[PDB]
């Protein structure tokens, strides 16, 4: 379907920024299983704000308002 979105090298160039040296092979089924989780505790709190404000357009302030709640405050978009 669409979990082919973030690829194998697109996890490798993340893990280089994380400062690891040799990536195993079993990670590429775990990382997609932990990136699909983090888009179900932000988007689920971005749909809830946008449905509440009676809009059908998820805006850049909802996601910063959702990420404000669970201690991952994101600067650079508004507040």
């Amino acid at each position: 379907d669409n979990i082919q979105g973030i690829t194998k090298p697109a996890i490798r160039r993340l893990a280089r920024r994380g400062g690891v040296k040799r990536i195993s092979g079993l990670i590429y089924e775990e990382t997609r299983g932990v990136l699909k989780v983090f888009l179900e505790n932000v988007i689920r709190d971005a749909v809830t704000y946008t449905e509440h404000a009676k809009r059908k357009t998820v805006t850049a302030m909802d996601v910063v308002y959702a990420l404000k709640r669970q201690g991952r405050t994101l600067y650079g978009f508004g507040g």
Binding site: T48, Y49, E51, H52, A53
Partner: protein, 94 residues
């Protein structure tokens, strides 16, 4: 003197409606005193940060129905919405 106004009876009325031959110890009264506040002062300070986004003032029964689906993680949000709204349509129609 010093009424101080806990929830010492209302919790105990709920205990006589789900296990009507039990009792609750007075130490565990003070815990369930401070578990309904931690839902009260977490929803009420959530609708205060949600009416302030859209710039309204009226905390309605929709700035609470949105502020329950954020806190209650899963299978408590799918009941306390349908349990709360049960105690609103039964409110205004009498």
């Amino acid at each position: 003197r010093k009424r101080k106004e806990s929830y010492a009876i209302y919790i105990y009325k709920v205990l006589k409606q789900v296990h009507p031959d039990t009792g609750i110890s007075s130490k565990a009264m003070s815990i369930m005193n401070s578990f309904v506040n931690d839902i009260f002062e977490r929803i009420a300070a959530e609708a205060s940060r949600l009416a302030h986004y859209n710039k309204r003032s009226t905390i309605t029964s929709r700035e609470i129905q949105t502020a329950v689906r954020l806190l209650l993680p899963g299978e408590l949000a799918k009941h306390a919405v349908s349990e709360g709204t049960k105690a609103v349509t039964k409110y205004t129609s009498s």
